PDB file of C-alpha atoms in Angstrom:
ATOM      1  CA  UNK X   1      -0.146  29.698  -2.809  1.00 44.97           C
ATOM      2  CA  UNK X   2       3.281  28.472  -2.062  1.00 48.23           C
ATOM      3  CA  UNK X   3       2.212  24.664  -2.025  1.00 49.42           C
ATOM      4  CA  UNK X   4       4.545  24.681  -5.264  1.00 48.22           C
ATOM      5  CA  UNK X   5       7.477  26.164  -3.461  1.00 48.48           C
ATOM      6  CA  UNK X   6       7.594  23.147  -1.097  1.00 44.53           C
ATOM      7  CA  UNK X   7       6.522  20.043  -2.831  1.00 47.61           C
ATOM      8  CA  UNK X   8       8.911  21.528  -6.112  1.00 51.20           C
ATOM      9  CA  UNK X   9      11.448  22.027  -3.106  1.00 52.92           C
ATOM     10  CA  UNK X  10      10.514  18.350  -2.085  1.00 56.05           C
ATOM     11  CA  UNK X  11      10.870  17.163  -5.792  1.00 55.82           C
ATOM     12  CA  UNK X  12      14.151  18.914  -6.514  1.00 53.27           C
ATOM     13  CA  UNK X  13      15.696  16.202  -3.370  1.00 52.44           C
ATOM     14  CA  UNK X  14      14.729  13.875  -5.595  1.00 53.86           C
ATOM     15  CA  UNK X  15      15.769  15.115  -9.296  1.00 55.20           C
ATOM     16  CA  UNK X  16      18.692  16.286  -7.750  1.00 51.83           C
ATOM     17  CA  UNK X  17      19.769  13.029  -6.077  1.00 52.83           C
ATOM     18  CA  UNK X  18      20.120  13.814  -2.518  1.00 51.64           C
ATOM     19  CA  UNK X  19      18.475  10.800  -0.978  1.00 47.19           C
ATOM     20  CA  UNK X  20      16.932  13.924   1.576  1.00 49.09           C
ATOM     21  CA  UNK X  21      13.277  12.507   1.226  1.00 48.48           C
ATOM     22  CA  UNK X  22      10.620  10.054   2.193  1.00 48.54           C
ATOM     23  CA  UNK X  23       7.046   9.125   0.704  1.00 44.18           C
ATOM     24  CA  UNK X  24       4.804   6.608   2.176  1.00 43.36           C
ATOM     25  CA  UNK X  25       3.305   5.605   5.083  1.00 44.53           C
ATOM     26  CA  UNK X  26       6.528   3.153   6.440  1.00 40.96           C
ATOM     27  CA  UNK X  27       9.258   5.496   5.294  1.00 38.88           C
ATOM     28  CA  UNK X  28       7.618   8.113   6.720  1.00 38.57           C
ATOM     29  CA  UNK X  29       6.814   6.824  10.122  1.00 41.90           C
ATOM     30  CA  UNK X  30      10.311   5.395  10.314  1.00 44.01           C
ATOM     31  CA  UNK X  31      12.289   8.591   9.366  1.00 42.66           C
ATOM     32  CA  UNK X  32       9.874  10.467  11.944  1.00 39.39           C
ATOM     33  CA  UNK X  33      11.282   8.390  14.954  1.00 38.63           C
ATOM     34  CA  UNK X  34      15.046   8.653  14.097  1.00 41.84           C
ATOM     35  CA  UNK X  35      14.618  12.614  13.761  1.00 43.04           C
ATOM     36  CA  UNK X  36      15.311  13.055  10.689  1.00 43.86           C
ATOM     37  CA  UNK X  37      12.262  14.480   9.139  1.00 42.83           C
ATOM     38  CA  UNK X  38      12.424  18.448   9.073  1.00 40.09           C
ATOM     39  CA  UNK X  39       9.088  19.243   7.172  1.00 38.85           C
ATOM     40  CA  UNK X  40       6.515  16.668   6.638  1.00 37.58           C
ATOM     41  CA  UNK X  41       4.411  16.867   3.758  1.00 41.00           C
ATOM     42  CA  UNK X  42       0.620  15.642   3.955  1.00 37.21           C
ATOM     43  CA  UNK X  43      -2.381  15.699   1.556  1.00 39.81           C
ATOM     44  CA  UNK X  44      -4.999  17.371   3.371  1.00 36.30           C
ATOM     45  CA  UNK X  45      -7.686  14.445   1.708  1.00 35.48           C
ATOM     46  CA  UNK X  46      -5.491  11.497   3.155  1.00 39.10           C
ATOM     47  CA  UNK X  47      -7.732   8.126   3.490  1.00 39.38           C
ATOM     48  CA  UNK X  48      -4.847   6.630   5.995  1.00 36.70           C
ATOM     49  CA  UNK X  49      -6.619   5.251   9.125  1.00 38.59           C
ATOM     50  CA  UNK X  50      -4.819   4.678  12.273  1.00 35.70           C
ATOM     51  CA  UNK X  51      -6.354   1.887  14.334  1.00 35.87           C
ATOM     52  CA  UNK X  52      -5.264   1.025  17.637  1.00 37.03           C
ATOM     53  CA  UNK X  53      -5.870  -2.240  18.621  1.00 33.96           C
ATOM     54  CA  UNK X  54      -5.913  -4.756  21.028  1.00 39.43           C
ATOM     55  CA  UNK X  55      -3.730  -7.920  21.573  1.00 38.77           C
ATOM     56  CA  UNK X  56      -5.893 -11.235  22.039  1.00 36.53           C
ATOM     57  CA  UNK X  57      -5.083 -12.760  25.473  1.00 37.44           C
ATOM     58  CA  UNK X  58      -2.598 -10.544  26.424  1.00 38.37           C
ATOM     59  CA  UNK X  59      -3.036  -6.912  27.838  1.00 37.90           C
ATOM     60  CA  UNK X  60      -0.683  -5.472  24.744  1.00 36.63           C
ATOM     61  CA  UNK X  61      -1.726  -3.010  22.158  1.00 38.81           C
ATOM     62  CA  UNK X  62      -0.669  -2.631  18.518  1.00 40.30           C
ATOM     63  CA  UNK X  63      -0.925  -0.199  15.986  1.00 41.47           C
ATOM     64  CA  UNK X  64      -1.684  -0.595  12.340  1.00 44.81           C
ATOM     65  CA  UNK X  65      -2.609   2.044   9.431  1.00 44.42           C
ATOM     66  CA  UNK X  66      -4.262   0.887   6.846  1.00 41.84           C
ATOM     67  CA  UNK X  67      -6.684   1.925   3.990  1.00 40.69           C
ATOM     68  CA  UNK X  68     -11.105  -5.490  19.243  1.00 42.92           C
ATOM     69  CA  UNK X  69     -10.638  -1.960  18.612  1.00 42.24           C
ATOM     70  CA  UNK X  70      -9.752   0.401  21.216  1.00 47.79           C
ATOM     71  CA  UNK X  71      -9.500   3.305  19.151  1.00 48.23           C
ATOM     72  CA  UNK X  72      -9.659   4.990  15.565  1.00 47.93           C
ATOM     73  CA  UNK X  73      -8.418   7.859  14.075  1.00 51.45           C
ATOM     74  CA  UNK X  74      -7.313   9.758  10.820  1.00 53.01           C
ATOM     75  CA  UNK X  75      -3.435   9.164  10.441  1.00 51.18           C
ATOM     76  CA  UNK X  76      -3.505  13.159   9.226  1.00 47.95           C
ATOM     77  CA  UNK X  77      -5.414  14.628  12.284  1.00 48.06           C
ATOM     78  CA  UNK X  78      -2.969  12.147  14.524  1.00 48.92           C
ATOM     79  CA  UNK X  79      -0.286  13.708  12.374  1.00 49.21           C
ATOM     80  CA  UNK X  80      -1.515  17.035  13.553  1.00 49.45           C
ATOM     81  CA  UNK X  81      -1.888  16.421  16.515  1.00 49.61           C
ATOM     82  CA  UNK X  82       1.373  14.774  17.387  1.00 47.85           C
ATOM     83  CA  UNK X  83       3.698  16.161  15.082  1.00 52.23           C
ATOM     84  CA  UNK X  84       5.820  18.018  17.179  1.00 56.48           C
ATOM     85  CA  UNK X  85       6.815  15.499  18.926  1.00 57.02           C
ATOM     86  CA  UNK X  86       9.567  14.568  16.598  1.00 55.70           C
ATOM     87  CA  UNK X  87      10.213  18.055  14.807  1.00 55.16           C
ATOM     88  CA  UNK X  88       9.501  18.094  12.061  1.00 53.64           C
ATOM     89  CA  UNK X  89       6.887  21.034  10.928  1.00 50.06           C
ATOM     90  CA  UNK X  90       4.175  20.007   8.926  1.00 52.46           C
ATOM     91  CA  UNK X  91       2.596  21.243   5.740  1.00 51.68           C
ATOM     92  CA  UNK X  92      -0.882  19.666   4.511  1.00 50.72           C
ATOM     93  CA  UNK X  93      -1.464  20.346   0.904  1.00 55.25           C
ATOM     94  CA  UNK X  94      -4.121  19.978  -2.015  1.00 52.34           C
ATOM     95  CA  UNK X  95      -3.972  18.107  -5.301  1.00 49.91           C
ATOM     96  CA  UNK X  96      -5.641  21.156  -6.820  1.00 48.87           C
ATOM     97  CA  UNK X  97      -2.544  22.432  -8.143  1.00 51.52           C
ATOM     98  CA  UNK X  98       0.070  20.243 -10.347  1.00 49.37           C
ATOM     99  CA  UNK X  99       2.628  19.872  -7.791  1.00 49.43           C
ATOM    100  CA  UNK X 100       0.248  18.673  -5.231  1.00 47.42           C
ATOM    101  CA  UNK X 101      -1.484  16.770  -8.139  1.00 49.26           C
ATOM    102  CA  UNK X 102       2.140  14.093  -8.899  1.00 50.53           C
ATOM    103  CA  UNK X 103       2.419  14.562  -4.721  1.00 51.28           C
ATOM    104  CA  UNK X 104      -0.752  12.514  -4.544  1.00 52.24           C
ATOM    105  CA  UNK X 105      -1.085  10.840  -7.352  1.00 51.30           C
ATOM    106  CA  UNK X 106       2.669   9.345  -7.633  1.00 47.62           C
ATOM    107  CA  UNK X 107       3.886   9.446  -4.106  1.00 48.22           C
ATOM    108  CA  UNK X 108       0.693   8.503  -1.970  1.00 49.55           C
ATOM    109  CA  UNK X 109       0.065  12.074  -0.546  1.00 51.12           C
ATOM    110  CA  UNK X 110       2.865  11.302   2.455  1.00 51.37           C
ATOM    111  CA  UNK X 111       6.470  12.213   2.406  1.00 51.42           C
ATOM    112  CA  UNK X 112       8.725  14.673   4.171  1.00 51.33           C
ATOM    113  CA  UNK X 113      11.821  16.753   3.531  1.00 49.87           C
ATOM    114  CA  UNK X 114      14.408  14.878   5.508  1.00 49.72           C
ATOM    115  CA  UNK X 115      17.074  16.163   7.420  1.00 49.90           C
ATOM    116  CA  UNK X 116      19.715  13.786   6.360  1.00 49.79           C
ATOM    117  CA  UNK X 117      20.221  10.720   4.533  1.00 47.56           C
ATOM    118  CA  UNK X 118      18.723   7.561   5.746  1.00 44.62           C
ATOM    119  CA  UNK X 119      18.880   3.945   4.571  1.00 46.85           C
ATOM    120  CA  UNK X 120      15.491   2.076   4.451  1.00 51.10           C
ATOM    121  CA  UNK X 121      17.563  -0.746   3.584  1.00 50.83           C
TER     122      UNK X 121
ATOM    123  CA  UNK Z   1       0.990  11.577 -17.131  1.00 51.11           C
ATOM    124  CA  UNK Z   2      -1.343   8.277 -16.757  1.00 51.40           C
ATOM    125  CA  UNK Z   3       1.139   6.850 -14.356  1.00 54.59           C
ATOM    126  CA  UNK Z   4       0.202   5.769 -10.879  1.00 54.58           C
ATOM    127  CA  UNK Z   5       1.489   4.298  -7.736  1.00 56.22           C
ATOM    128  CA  UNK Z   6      -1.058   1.846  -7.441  1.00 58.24           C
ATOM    129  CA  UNK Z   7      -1.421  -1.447  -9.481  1.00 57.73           C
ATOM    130  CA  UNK Z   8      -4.005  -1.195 -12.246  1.00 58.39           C
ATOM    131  CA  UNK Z   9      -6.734  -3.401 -12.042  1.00 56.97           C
ATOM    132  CA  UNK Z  10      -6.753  -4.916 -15.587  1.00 57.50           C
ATOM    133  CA  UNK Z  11      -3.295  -5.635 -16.054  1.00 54.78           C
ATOM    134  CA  UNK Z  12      -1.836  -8.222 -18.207  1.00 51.23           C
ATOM    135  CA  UNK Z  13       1.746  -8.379 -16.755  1.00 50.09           C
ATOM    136  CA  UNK Z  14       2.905  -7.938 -12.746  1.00 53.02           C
ATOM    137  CA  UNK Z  15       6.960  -7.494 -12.588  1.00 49.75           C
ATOM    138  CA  UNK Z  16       9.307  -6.845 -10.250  1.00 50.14           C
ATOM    139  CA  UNK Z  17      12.732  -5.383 -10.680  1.00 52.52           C
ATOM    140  CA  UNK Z  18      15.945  -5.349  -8.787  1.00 52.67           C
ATOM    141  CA  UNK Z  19      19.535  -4.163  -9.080  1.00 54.90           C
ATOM    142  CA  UNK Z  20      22.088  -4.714  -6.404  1.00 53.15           C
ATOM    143  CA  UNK Z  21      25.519  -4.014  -6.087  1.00 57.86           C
ATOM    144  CA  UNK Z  22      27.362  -6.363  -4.118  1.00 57.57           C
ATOM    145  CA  UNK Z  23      30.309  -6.369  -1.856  1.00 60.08           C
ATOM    146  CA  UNK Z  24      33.247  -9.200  -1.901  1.00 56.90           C
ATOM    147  CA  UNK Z  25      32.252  -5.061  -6.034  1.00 57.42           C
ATOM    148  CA  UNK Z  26      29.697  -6.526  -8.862  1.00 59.62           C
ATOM    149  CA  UNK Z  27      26.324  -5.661  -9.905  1.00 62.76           C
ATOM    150  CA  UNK Z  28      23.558  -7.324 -11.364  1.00 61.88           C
ATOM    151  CA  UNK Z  29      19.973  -6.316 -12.677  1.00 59.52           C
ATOM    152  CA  UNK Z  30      16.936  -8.175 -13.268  1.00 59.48           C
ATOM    153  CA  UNK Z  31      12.883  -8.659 -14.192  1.00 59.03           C
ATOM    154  CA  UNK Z  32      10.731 -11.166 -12.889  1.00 59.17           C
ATOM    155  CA  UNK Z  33       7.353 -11.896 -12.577  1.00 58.57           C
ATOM    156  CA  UNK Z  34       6.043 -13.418  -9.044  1.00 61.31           C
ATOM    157  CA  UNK Z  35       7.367 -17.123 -10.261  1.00 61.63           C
ATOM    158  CA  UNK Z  36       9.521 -16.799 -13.422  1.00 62.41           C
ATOM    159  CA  UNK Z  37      12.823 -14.359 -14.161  1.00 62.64           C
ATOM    160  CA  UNK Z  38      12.039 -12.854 -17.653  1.00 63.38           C
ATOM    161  CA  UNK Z  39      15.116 -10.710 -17.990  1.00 61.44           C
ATOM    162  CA  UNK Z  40      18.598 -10.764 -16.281  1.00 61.97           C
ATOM    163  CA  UNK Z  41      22.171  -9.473 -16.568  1.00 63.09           C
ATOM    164  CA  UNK Z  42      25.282  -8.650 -15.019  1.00 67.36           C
ATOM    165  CA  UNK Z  43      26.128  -4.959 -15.826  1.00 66.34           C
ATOM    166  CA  UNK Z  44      29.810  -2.721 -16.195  1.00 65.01           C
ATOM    167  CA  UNK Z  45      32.317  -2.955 -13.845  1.00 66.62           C
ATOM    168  CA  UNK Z  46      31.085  -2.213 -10.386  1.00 69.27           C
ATOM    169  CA  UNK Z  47      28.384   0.073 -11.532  1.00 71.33           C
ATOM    170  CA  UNK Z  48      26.604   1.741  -8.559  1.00 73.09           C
ATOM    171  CA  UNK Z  49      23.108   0.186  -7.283  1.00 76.08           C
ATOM    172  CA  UNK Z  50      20.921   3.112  -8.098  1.00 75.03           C
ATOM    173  CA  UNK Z  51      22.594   3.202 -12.140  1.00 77.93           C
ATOM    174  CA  UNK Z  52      21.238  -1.034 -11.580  1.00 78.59           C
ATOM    175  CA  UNK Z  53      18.320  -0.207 -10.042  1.00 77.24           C
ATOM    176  CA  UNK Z  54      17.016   2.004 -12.767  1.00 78.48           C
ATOM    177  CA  UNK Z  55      18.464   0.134 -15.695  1.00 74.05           C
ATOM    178  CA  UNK Z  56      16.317  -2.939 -14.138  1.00 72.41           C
ATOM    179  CA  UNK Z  57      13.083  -0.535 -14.421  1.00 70.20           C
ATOM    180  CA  UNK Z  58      14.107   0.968 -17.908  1.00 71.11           C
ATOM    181  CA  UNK Z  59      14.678  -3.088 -19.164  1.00 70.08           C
ATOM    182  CA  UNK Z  60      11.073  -3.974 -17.730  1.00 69.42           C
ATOM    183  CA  UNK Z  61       9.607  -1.026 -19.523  1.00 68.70           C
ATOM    184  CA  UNK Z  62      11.138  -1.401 -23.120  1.00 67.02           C
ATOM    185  CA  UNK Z  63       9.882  -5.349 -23.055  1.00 66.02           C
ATOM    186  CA  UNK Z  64       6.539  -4.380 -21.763  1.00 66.48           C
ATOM    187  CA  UNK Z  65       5.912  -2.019 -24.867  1.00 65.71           C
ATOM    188  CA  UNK Z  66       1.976  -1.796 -25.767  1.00 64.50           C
ATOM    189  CA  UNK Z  67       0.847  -3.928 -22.847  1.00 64.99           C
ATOM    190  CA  UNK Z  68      -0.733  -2.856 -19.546  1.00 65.39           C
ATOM    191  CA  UNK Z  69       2.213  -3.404 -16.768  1.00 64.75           C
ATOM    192  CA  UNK Z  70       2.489  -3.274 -13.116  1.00 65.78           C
ATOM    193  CA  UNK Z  71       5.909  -2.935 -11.755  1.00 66.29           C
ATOM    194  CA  UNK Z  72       7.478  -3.267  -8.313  1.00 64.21           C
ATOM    195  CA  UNK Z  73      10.995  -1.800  -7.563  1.00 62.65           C
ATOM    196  CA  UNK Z  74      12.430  -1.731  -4.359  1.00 66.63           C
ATOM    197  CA  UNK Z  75      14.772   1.111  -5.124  1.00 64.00           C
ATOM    198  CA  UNK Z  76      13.382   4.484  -3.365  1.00 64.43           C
ATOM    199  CA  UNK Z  77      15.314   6.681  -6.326  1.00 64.66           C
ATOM    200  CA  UNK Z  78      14.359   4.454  -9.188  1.00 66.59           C
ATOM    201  CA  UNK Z  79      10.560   4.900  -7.925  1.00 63.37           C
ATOM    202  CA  UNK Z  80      11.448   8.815  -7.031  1.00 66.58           C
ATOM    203  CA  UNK Z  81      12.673   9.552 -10.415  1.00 67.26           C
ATOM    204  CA  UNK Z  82       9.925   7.786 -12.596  1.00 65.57           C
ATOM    205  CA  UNK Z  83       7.258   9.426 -10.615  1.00 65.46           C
ATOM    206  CA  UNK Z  84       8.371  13.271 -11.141  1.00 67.52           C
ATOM    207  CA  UNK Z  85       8.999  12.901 -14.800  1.00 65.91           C
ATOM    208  CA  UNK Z  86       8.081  16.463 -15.378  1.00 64.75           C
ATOM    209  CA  UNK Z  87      11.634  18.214 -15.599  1.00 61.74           C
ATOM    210  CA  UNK Z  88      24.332  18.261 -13.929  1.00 57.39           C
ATOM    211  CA  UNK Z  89      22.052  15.773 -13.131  1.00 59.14           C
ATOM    212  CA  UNK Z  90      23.493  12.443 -11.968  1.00 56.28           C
ATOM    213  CA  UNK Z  91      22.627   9.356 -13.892  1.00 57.39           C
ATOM    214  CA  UNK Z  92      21.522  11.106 -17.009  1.00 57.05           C
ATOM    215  CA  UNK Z  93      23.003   8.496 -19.243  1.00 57.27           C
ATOM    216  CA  UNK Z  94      20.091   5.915 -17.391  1.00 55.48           C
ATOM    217  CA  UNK Z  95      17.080   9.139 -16.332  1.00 58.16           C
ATOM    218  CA  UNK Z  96      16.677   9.605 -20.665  1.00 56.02           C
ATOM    219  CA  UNK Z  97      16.421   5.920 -21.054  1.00 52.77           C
ATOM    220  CA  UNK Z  98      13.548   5.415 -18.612  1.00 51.70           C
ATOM    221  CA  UNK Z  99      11.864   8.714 -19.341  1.00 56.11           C
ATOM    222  CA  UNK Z 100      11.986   7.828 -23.071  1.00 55.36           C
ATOM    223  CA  UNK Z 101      10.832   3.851 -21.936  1.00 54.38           C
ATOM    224  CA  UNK Z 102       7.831   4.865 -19.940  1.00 53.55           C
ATOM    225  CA  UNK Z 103       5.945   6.049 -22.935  1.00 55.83           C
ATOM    226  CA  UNK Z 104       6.313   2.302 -24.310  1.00 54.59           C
ATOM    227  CA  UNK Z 105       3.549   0.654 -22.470  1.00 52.65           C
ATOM    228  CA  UNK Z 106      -0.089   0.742 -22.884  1.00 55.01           C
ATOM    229  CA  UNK Z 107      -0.946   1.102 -18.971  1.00 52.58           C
ATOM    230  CA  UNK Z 108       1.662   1.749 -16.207  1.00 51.60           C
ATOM    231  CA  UNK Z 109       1.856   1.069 -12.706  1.00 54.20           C
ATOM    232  CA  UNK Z 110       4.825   1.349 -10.678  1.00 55.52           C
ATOM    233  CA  UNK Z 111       4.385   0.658  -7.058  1.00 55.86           C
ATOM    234  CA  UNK Z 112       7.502   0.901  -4.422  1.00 54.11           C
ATOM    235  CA  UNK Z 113       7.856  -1.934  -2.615  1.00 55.01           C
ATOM    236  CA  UNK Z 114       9.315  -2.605   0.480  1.00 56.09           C
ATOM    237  CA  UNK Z 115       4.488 -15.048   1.575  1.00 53.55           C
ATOM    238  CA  UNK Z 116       2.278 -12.658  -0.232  1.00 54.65           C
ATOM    239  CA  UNK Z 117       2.674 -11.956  -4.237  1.00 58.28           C
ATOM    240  CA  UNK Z 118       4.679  -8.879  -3.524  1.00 58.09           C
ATOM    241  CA  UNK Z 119       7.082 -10.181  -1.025  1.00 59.20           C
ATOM    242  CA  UNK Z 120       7.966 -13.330  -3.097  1.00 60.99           C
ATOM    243  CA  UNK Z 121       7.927 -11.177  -6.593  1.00 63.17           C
ATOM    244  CA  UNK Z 122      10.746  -8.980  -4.928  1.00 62.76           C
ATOM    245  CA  UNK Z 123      12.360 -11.630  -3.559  1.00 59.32           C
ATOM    246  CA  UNK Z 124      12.923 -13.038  -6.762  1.00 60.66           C
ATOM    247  CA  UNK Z 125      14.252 -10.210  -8.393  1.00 61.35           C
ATOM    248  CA  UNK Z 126      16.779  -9.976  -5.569  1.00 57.91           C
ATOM    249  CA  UNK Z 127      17.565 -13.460  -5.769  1.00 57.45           C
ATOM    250  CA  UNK Z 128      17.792 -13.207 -10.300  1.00 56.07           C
ATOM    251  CA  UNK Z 129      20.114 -10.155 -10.063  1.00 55.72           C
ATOM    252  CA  UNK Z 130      22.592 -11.212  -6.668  1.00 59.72           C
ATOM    253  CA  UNK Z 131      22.871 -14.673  -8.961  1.00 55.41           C
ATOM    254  CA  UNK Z 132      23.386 -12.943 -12.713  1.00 53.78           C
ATOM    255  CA  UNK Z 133      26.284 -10.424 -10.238  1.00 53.38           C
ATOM    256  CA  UNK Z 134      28.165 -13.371  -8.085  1.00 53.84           C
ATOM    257  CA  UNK Z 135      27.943 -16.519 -10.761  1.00 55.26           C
ATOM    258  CA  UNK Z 136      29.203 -14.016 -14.170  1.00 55.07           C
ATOM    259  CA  UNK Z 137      31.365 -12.289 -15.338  1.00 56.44           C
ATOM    260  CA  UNK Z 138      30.444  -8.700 -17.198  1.00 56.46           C
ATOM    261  CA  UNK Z 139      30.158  -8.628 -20.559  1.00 61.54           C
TER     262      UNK Z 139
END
């Protein structure tokens, strides 16, 4: 309904050179933990996988998203579930309509409306 | 309204662009291919990164007319822009030249990027357009 008010909203950071957005999985992630995303954006089809996984010898655990286990989930229901953690509300969206359509197709279904400017140098 | 962020399976040309502007202020802009710089110059008096950045994409879209192309930029607003073609601006001078230049090629892929083909292909770039900015002088 008002998909197209948001991801225009999330287009016009873009068109109108702001530098107040993220797309992807990395830029994402990274803007999440230094608080900067205030709505994140997320196709509601996403095929991200979040894996946890286990560390050979050692007793350490790393993550990895991608496209011995200890555990597997969808990066969009672990985005739902754990979203509020870093504030940040959260809109999933649909390719159905033209806006979410470029979302999807152009920016890989991930981004956010940032609160301020960040580098990803 | 064919264009993607993910390479194209069939395509006859994988590029990567660049366009720094570097402190001391110069600027530089280039196209490469994993291997090989194509295209490279040193641009206008201390021109911003993002005007380098896009002229760098423009460049490898005019010399990739009629062929199928994936290209890599590093630059979030060069990548940003391209993709919502659909549309007091800033950089309209260089937004009209790549929205004119992205009708040029046959098949287009442009892919953000952040030892594999990728990491060396953007390294090169870097390398092309911080050398064609430090060792020359503008025009």
């Amino acid at each position: 309904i008002q998909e197209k008010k948001l991801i225009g909203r999330y287009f016009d950071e873009i068109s109108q050179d702001t530098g107040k957005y993220c797309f992807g999985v990395e830029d994402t992630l990274k803007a999440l933990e230094m608080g900067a995303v205030e709505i994140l954006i997320v196709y509601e089809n996403l095929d991200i996988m979040r894996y946890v996984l286990h560390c050979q010898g050692t007793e350490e655990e790393k993550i990895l998203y991608l496209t011995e286990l200890i555990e597997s989930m969808p990066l969009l229901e672990w985005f739902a579930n754990n979203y509020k953690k870093f504030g940040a509300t959260l809109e999933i969206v649909t390719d159905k309509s033209q806006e979410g359509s470029q979302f999807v197709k152009g920016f890989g279904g991930i981004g956010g409306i940032l609160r301020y400017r960040v580098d990803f140098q | 309204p064919d264009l993607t962020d993910q390479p194209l399976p069939d395509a006859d040309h994988t590029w990567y662009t660049d366009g720094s502007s570097l402190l001391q202020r110069k600027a530089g802009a280039a196209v490469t291919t994993e291997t090989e710089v194509i295209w490279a110059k040193a641009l206008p008096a201390g021109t911003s990164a993002q005007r380098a950045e896009l002229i760098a994409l423009t460049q490898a879209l005019k010399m990739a007319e009629g062929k199928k192309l994936n290209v890599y930029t590093d630059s979030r607003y060069a990548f940003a822009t391209a993709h919502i073609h659909g549309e007091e601006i800033k950089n309209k001078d260089e937004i009209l030249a790549l929205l004119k230049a992205l009708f040029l090629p046959k098949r287009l892929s442009i892919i953000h990027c952040p030892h594999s083909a990728e990491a060396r292909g953007n390294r090169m770039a870097d390398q092309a357009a911080r050398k064609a900015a430090i060792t020359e002088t503008p025009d």
